[PDB]
Motif scaffolding. Structure first.
Motif, PDB file in Angstrom:
ATOM      1  N   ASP D 152       0.819  -1.204   0.000  1.00  0.00           N
ATOM      2  CA  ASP D 152       0.000   0.000   0.000  1.00  0.00           C
ATOM      3  C   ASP D 152       0.860   1.264   0.000  1.00  0.00           C
ATOM      4  OD1 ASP D 152      -1.647   1.921   2.313  1.00  0.00           O
ATOM      5  OD2 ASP D 152      -2.715   1.335   0.499  1.00  0.00           O
ATOM      6  N   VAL D 155       2.075   1.761  -3.538  1.00  0.00           N
ATOM      7  CA  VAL D 155       1.000   2.112  -4.461  1.00  0.00           C
ATOM      8  C   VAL D 155       0.446   3.496  -4.140  1.00  0.00           C
ATOM      9  CG1 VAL D 155      -1.300   1.479  -5.242  1.00  0.00           C
ATOM     10  CG2 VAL D 155       0.425  -0.284  -4.979  1.00  0.00           C
ATOM     11  N   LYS D 156       0.333   3.832  -2.853  1.00  0.00           N
ATOM     12  CA  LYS D 156      -0.213   5.134  -2.474  1.00  0.00           C
ATOM     13  C   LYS D 156       0.734   6.262  -2.856  1.00  0.00           C
ATOM     14  CE  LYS D 156      -4.245   4.210  -0.809  1.00  0.00           C
ATOM     15  NZ  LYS D 156      -4.397   3.586   0.568  1.00  0.00           N
ATOM     16  N   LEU D 159       1.197   5.789  -7.295  1.00  0.00           N
ATOM     17  CA  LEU D 159       0.018   5.946  -8.132  1.00  0.00           C
ATOM     18  C   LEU D 159      -0.991   6.933  -7.567  1.00  0.00           C
ATOM     19  CD1 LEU D 159      -0.577   2.296  -9.319  1.00  0.00           C
ATOM     20  CD2 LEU D 159       0.560   4.097 -10.515  1.00  0.00           C
ATOM     21  N   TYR D 160      -1.433   6.760  -6.319  1.00  0.00           N
ATOM     22  CA  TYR D 160      -2.462   7.644  -5.765  1.00  0.00           C
ATOM     23  C   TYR D 160      -1.936   9.067  -5.631  1.00  0.00           C
ATOM     24  CZ  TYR D 160      -5.683   3.775  -4.298  1.00  0.00           C
ATOM     25  OH  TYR D 160      -6.506   2.658  -4.270  1.00  0.00           O
ATOM     26  N   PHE D 163      -1.906  10.664  -8.952  1.00  0.00           N
ATOM     27  CA  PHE D 163      -3.278  10.957  -9.366  1.00  0.00           C
ATOM     28  C   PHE D 163      -3.795  12.223  -8.690  1.00  0.00           C
ATOM     29  CE2 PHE D 163      -7.645  10.642 -10.317  1.00  0.00           C
ATOM     30  CZ  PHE D 163      -8.375  10.663  -9.132  1.00  0.00           C
ATOM     31  N   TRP D 164      -3.645  12.318  -7.368  1.00  0.00           N
ATOM     32  CA  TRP D 164      -4.220  13.451  -6.654  1.00  0.00           C
ATOM     33  C   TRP D 164      -3.544  14.761  -7.042  1.00  0.00           C
ATOM     34  CZ3 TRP D 164      -3.635   9.902  -1.903  1.00  0.00           C
ATOM     35  CH2 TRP D 164      -4.795   9.142  -1.719  1.00  0.00           C
ATOM     36  N   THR D 166      -1.872  15.451  -9.869  1.00  0.00           N
ATOM     37  CA  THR D 166      -2.170  15.772 -11.260  1.00  0.00           C
ATOM     38  C   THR D 166      -3.581  16.340 -11.388  1.00  0.00           C
ATOM     39  OG1 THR D 166      -0.635  14.066 -12.031  1.00  0.00           O
ATOM     40  CG2 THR D 166      -2.338  14.763 -13.541  1.00  0.00           C
ATOM     41  N   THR D 199       5.036  -2.881 -10.613  1.00  0.00           N
ATOM     42  CA  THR D 199       3.604  -2.672 -10.838  1.00  0.00           C
ATOM     43  C   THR D 199       3.280  -1.189 -10.977  1.00  0.00           C
ATOM     44  OG1 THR D 199       3.056  -4.710  -9.644  1.00  0.00           O
ATOM     45  CG2 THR D 199       1.325  -3.099  -9.904  1.00  0.00           C
ATOM     46  N   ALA D 202       4.959   0.503 -14.304  1.00  0.00           N
ATOM     47  CA  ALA D 202       4.184   0.239 -15.515  1.00  0.00           C
ATOM     48  C   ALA D 202       2.876   1.018 -15.484  1.00  0.00           C
ATOM     49  CB  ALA D 202       3.919  -1.265 -15.684  1.00  0.00           C
ATOM     50  N   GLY D 203       2.219   1.047 -14.329  1.00  0.00           N
ATOM     51  CA  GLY D 203       0.998   1.830 -14.192  1.00  0.00           C
ATOM     52  C   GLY D 203       1.199   3.289 -14.562  1.00  0.00           C
ATOM     53  N   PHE D 207      -0.909   5.538 -17.348  1.00  0.00           N
ATOM     54  CA  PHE D 207      -1.522   6.784 -16.888  1.00  0.00           C
ATOM     55  C   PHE D 207      -1.076   7.959 -17.760  1.00  0.00           C
ATOM     56  CE2 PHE D 207      -3.594   8.969 -13.385  1.00  0.00           C
ATOM     57  CZ  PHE D 207      -3.097  10.244 -13.455  1.00  0.00           C
TER      58      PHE D 207
END
Ligand SMILES: NC(=O)c1ccc[n+]([C@@H]2O[C@H](COP(=O)([O-])OP(=O)(O)OC[C@H]3O[C@@H](n4cnc5c(N)ncnc54)[C@H](O)[C@@H]3O)[C@@H](O)[C@H]2O)c1
Ligand SMILES: NC(=O)c1ccc[n+]([C@@H]2O[C@H](COP(=O)([O-])OP(=O)(O)OC[C@H]3O[C@@H](n4cnc5c(N)ncnc54)[C@H](O)[C@@H]3O)[C@@H](O)[C@H]2O)c1
Ligand SMILES: NC(=O)c1ccc[n+]([C@@H]2O[C@H](COP(=O)([O-])OP(=O)(O)OC[C@H]3O[C@@H](n4cnc5c(N)ncnc54)[C@H](O)[C@@H]3O)[C@@H](O)[C@H]2O)c1
Ligand SMILES: NC(=O)c1ccc[n+]([C@@H]2O[C@H](COP(=O)([O-])OP(=O)(O)OC[C@H]3O[C@@H](n4cnc5c(N)ncnc54)[C@H](O)[C@@H]3O)[C@@H](O)[C@H]2O)c1
Ligand SMILES: [Mg+2]
Ligand SMILES: [Mg+2]
Ligand SMILES: [Mg+2]
Ligand SMILES: [Mg+2]
Ligand code: NA
Ligand code: NA
Lengths: 291, 291, 291, 292
Positions: D152, D155-156, D159-160, D163-164, D166, D199, D202-203, D207
């Protein structure tokens, strides 16, 4: 800041077939290779460059940029394109650099050898090689593809690159660059570009393998992967006439690239400061998002 | 359930060099092409197949599997490999099927047409084509690569495929399959496989483009991407002798593949039930994780 | 031989919308998961399998195929899909094998653990795991994407896979297989699938990395990359309604896949004989030519 | 003139040097070269307004220096424990005559991501280059050892957080702006010991490509940079195990890792207004691995 979407022309364009390889001066509109917009900043001062297919298109934009960054430039081209080539020679010389015009067909092995020898002799050395010449002739079916068609594409796009590169390497000192133009077609692999796409994928593997060979000796080998650009390669049969009229209409910008836009990739890859870029494929495809 | 790691031999192997193309019978160990292990189950009954390089290696494993799945099989190979090929002919006939032996050099355009014509004549048709023959000769430097060497690789691996494929399409009914053997080298692009890797990337783009031409006609075109396999291609100079001794020691399994292991990919791609696989590249590389 | 183009329905399809996750039985036409056409051939006799999202679509096609090949099958699904799931249970049992139905929400880590434990308990073991369940909800702009929306996609498609796989590995003997369903969107990366494409690219890297971990321990980990298929993921918001009406009209076949067509990939990857396929991504996209 | 890139920078072996993450560049042996002495600007980003996450050290520090010397004002994110590294970057930005903004905080927190962007835009009077470069990388040899907390956190962050940040940034970005995301060759090399990290990397590419298709039509370009191995605290604080760090990139074609200085030119080239048909791209700099 400028919005890139509407910086350049969008389709539809007028019907405009030419026989290959075509002339930029006969396209409607004429392509923008950076003649007015590209301003150098001393990024390649005193470099010695050979650009195949430097008369028109992406090669011409790279030639102009190199000269304005302080590099001397030899260009190869086919004799039929002399009128385009003379414009590039004039642009190189107006930037205060040495220009060399070396017409000939790179399908001919002995010409490839003469080309490199005369470029290096004229320039007093060689330390940027750009393999950019290409043949591209769309065909909808393999049934229409003769051995002569297949062979012309492979001999231009793979053998020519092999012969020129092989002849060039003994001239190239540590710190030198080789840059090969490939295409998003390497993996988009359209039905109507069977032989072309085969060679453009081959160019990328050739680039990656040669980078592993030459990297340990201090020579960097990289590739540039354009998406759709407004060049005579396209309007002289690289795409069918109706595709040319509406070229790249369905892309994210809704327009094709202009050659001016991709010259910065060639300057960045060749610059001495970009010292850990080796074996790379840098795309500029307007949002197709391939390389 | 079987642990795949321990199912087949691991390096080091004995020092062993052959002149190309080599014989499987002279390797130590001899490759396992599935002679004892592959059991058919009616997956290609009545199909009519041509496998280039079917005398040894991956092509032999494919030929054995095709015959045991109910297909008649023609194999191409070079004349010096007759002793390997005769074993494959006997295995095809032992499965109750028709075997055709068609030695000849696919660098020769006219032999390529003769090969397809004779395979189709003997079998009463043709509906699976496997372009699998290849030349692979490792060299550490482009400086030592002659035009003869480069040309031999390109003519075998790209022109031969083009000529055979073009000659075969008029024979292929809707529902047929074309399968092209490529390589992880298409993108791994080792320093010592400059010409080879060029061709193997080319084969993938050729597959993808042709799949877009022929898919709409009902003919599927796919590629198989092996990682390292124990075959005479490697010990006859595809890799240098000390790499052969230690072949694939650094891989996740610690061993190269045996041809037996990749035959199932060829059966699955050709099977009529696999009807939405077209333009694909299916890898079997032991965990390198490339295709 | 049968032409694969005309084997299944082509658009346009009726306008149709369902609330997610949707039911296969409510689509027009109802999808073909191989209920009538898939023929088992004894390729997985006695195996013990868990398929998430086995109630409908691709996972349903895989579950039917596994059972007909001789495997016992547990399926996961969301509780509201009971009516689809019970049809699958009936087909598994009609093939002579054991069926287990294990509904629940894999965004719940504790459920992921119960799912794996109950599957292995009911089957008497576990040696094929298929992570196939997914969330897919199209959105045109990141401005409209709430954290709740992004989190739902990532928790279903990445965390659920992680939790289930981690829980499963202590049950899996040498010889076992893990298969993860990804998508061509991993690299096609449409504008309207920002969160989804992120996860599907992630799944490929997860597959490759885990294959390097588990391969040496005798467990193979692979991925399947479908192109467009006719499933309730699409008509329940995975694509906007007008795209569903014309789904895959522009593809080489001019139709989407039916789930029946991709089942052979799951069988081939699971079979013991496919022993050098590890870390792979096998595509079935009808000629888009992506994986 | 011409310089041989092979021996431009130090080669292994390096001393044993474990740090707790996120680590400090000042405690590495040798200290990385971020371009402090060598990078010369040429007016390629005059007046631009930039936010670089993880701009205290490593690749993000090298980008920050280059952006400032090319004429752009620069805000940097980082974690509070890296203050001593960040203060050096602030001084380098200011010495180029640009405005610097220091915005420490943890991007795993959605509220902080929103305030990071608001405070960066307010301080600079706008925003038109966003570089999502912060990352967590912690090697583990087996999934059996990987806890949900470990997965987590990666990933947080990767990726997260992206996301937030951007999402909050896009309303500020005018036509002509750039978003640049740092990914990794691990996106496809996908080593056994980087399961969660690969992971996410690549994500990040998917994106980038999807968002380039969203925003390209509006005049905002979204691209990614894919480094190979570089000498940074991410590696010596557990991104790789200690014995790998000692011998980092010894087997690569140059026989050495990259120094962050070497990759800054990619960030400048992507952001420059003249590079106007580069959108959705992944530009690699991996020293001859030949991945992107
Ligand atoms: N224009 C596009 O949409 C597009 C897309 C992807 C890739 N590319 C690549 O762009 C590169 C440059 O082409 P362009 O698009 O700028 O078009 P262009 O027509 O301006 O340039 C191609 C050049 O190739 C040279 N050439 C061709 N055959 C030759 C031969 N036998 N001997 C010597 N020179 C020869 C010609 O001098 C010609 O100027 C090519 O490598 C092509 O593959 C272009
Ligand atoms: N063995 C590996 O590690 C490896 C790895 C990746 C890809 N491949 C591919 O596997 C395929 C099969 O090779 P293999 O490894 O089974 O080796 P192999 O030597 O058993 O088969 C290659 C065959 O090519 C044929 N051939 C070569 N030149 C020919 C010519 N001029 N005319 C006609 N036939 C000719 C020969 O009959 C020979 O048996 C090739 O396409 C190769 O690129 C092999
Ligand atoms: N249909 C296509 O065009 C398409 C294209 C590419 C990839 N795929 C992939 O195919 C796979 C299968 O989907 P499909 O197209 O067969 O659709 P589908 O709707 O039939 O299957 C998806 C299944 O996911 C399961 N699921 C979703 N969220 C869940 C949750 N929170 N907990 C438990 N189960 C949950 C449901 O049981 C559902 O049946 C997916 O991984 C998808 O990404 C589909
Ligand atoms: N160094 C390499 O070998 C390598 C290789 C491939 C890719 N990369 C990528 O390079 C990028 C930059 O890293 P680097 O190698 O320069 O190392 P680095 O340690 O200097 O930079 C990473 C930065 O991430 C920031 N960060 C981490 N967690 C954070 C959190 N929760 N909140 C806020 N900030 C946080 C820290 O400020 C840290 O300085 C990363 O995206 C990484 O994936 C690095
Ligand atoms: Mg021209
Ligand atoms: Mg042989
Ligand atoms: Mg369902
Ligand atoms: Mg730091
Ligand atoms: Na790239
Ligand atoms: Na694949």
């Amino acid at each position: 800041l400028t919005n890139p979407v509407d910086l350049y022309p969008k389709p539809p364009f007028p019907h405009q077939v030419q026989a290959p390889p075509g002339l930029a001066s006969r396209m409607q509109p004429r392509p923008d290779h950076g003649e007015q917009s590209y301003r150098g900043r001393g990024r390649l001062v005193g470099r010695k460059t050979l650009v195949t297919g430097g008369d028109s298109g992406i090669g011409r934009a790279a030639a102009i940029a190199f000269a304005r960054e302080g590099a001397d430039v030899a260009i190869g081209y086919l004799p039929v394109e002399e009128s385009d080539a003379r414009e590039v020679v004039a642009l190189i010389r107006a930037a205060g650099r040495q220009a060399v015009a070396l017409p000939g067909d790179i399908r001919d092995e002995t010409f490839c050898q003469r080309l490199v020898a005369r470029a290096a002799e004229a320039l007093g050395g060689l330390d940027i090689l750009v393999n950019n010449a290409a043949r591209q002739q769309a065909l909808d079916s393999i049934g229409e593809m003769t051995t002569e068609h297949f062979d012309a594409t492979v001999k231009t796009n793979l053998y020519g690159m092999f012969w020129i590169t092989k002849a060039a390497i003994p001239h190239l000192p540590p710190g030198a660059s080789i840059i090969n133009t490939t295409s998003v077609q390497a993996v988009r692999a359209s039905a109507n570009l069977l032989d072309y796409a085969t060679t453009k994928a081959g160019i990328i593997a050739f680039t990656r393998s040669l980078a592993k060979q030459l990297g340990p000796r201090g020579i960097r080998v990289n590739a540039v992967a354009p998406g759709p650009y407004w060049t005579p390669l396209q309007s002289s049969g690289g795409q069918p006439p109706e595709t040319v009229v509406n070229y790249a209409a369905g892309s994210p910008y809704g327009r094709p690239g202009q050659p001016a836009e991709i010259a910065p990739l060639y300057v960045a890859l060749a610059a001495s400061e970009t010292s850990y870029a080796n074996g790379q494929v840098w795309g500029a495809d307007g949002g197709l998002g391939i390389f």
